[PDB]
């Protein structure tokens, strides 16, 4: 971007809506890429303030979530709290 | 990247594993960003060939997936094709 921006709730509701749309797309774009590049399935679920649901699925959303439900073994599970720290490092 | 790469199953299993890890992180990073910037909840579910599960949640996968049980009407859903498609169209 033409200027560096910290990561914190964009205040101007106008700009916080222009950005949600722009990025949401890029996010899904990368998802899709990661999906094809490394041949893996991905489900992406987004919820905005107004609780409007947005989603993506490399192929089918119902399939991925199902497989997910019946998945009891362990696995990598991150959060923003986590991600924030992992970033405070490199 | 130091060179442009098409998007198709990375063949060299070595490189297709280095990339999965690198990107998967960046993806989650952006998710996290979109999450904080536009104050919205996001769940990210990844599955690799070996069916190893990887996931992210802006706060807790619990909340979102549960919160996805109520408002199940996706104001926007996308498949790998929409994206692929929307990629040229524009």
């Amino acid at each position: 971007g033409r200027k560096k921006i910290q990561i914190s709730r964009i205040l101007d509701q106008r700009n916080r809506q222009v950005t949600f749309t722009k990025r949401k797309f890029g996010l899904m774009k990368k998802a899709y890429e990661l999906s094809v590049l490394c041949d893996c399935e991905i489900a992406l679920i987004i919820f905005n303030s107004a609780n409007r649901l947005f989603q993506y699925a490399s192929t089918d959303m119902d399939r991925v979530l199902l497989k997910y439900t019946e998945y009891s073994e362990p696995h990598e599970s991150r959060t923003n709290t986590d991600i924030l720290e992992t970033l405070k490092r490199r | 990247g130091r060179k442009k790469i098409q998007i198709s199953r990375i063949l060299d299993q070595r490189n297709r594993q280095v990339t999965f890890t690198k990107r998967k992180f960046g993806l989650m990073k952006k998710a996290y960003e979109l999450s904080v910037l536009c104050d919205c909840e996001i769940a990210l579910i990844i599955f690799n060939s070996a069916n190893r599960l990887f996931q992210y949640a802006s706060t807790d996968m619990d909340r979102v997936l549960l919160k996805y049980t109520e408002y199940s009407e996706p104001h926007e859903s996308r498949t790998n094709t929409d994206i692929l498609e929307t990629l040229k169209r524009r």
């Binding site: 439900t69 073994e73 696995h75 | 619990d62």
Partner: peptide, 23 residues
């Protein structure tokens, strides 16, 4: 760099009954 257990154990249960009936 924290890993962790499955995402949930109960919620996953509720999510499923839904997904299936959604048919």
């Amino acid at each position: 760099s924290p890993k962790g257990t499955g995402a949930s154990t109960e919620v996953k249960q509720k999510l499923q009954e839904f997904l299936l009936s959604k048919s």
